[PDB]
Amino acid sequence: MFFIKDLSLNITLHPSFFGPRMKQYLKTKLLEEVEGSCTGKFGYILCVLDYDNIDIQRGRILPTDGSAEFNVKYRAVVFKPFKGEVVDGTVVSCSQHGFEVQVGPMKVFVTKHLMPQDLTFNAGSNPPSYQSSEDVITIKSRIRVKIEGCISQVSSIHAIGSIKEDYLGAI
């Protein structure tokens, strides 16, 4: 789910970048290293709100290296999936054990054993689709998936969905 939360992080700055306009350099490292990433504690990071009222706080110097340490509080939106969560998406890659469905920025595989039994793997077709008793699940089809479990590795969050139960399968 797409959630907004005020977060913070510590920034290490090279001493050559120590001029009066370094607050822009603070804004330089903030956008390119936070937005478009993922964290295991918060999810896939999306966009940072409020570009003007950003807490720069102060700045400390570590004993080694000569670099400078900071702590910048802000406001940003993230995307954190969960268990038992019903979502949608589109298939990108397929397999003989199921297929993987792109859900926004995160691709989630669905296993064949988490599918109904009448759903059958079509192998000789190009692309190798999945044909049931009424529908043929291909690449560009849109499929309503309920997320079963998730993997919360740091900066690499994965999940597992299914379409076995009622009101599921393709949209």
Partner 1 sequence: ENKDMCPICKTDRYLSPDVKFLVNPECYHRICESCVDRIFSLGPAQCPYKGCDKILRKNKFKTQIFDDVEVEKEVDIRKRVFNVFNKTIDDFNGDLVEYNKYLEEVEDIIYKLDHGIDVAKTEEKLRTYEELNKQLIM
Residue closer to partner 1 by CB (options 73, 97) is 97
Beta strands 156-162 and 106-111, pairing class: parallel
Amino acid, res. 45 = I
Residue 133, interface with partner 1 (CB under 8 A)? no
117, 123, 133, 154: which one contacts partner 1 (CB under 8 A)? 117
Residue 134, interface with partner 1 (CB under 8 A)? no
Vertex 39, ends 35 and 45: CA angle to 5°? Answer: 30
Q: With contacts defined by CB under 8 A, name the span among 5-13, 82-90, 91-99, 159-167 that binds partner 1.
A: 159-167
Alpha-carbon distance values, 121 to 6, 27, 90, 94, 102 (Å): 45, 50, 17, 10, 19
26, 37, 42, 116: which one contacts partner 1 (CB under 8 A)? 116
Return all residues near 93 (Cβ < 8 A) that are at least 6 apart.
99, 100, 107
Q: With contacts defined by CB under 8 A, name the span among 43-51, 65-73, 128-136, 161-169 that binds partner 1.
A: 161-169
* 31 secondary structure, DSSP code: H
Q: With contacts defined by CB under 8 A, name the span among 53-61, 70-78, 79-87, 158-166 that binds partner 1.
A: 158-166
* Residues within window 48-77 making contact with partner 1, judged by CB under 8 A: none
Residue closer to partner 1 by CB (options 29, 164) is 164
Q: Min. distance of Cβ 150 from partner 1 in angstroms?
A: 18
Residue 165, interface with partner 1 (CB under 8 A)? yes
* 142 secondary structure, DSSP code: B
How many Cβ atoms sit within 10 Å of the Cβ of residue 76?
Answer: 19
The gap between the terminal CA atoms of the chain, to the nearest Å, is: 19
Q: Which residues of this chain interact with partner 1, rule CB under 8 A? A: 116-117, 164-166
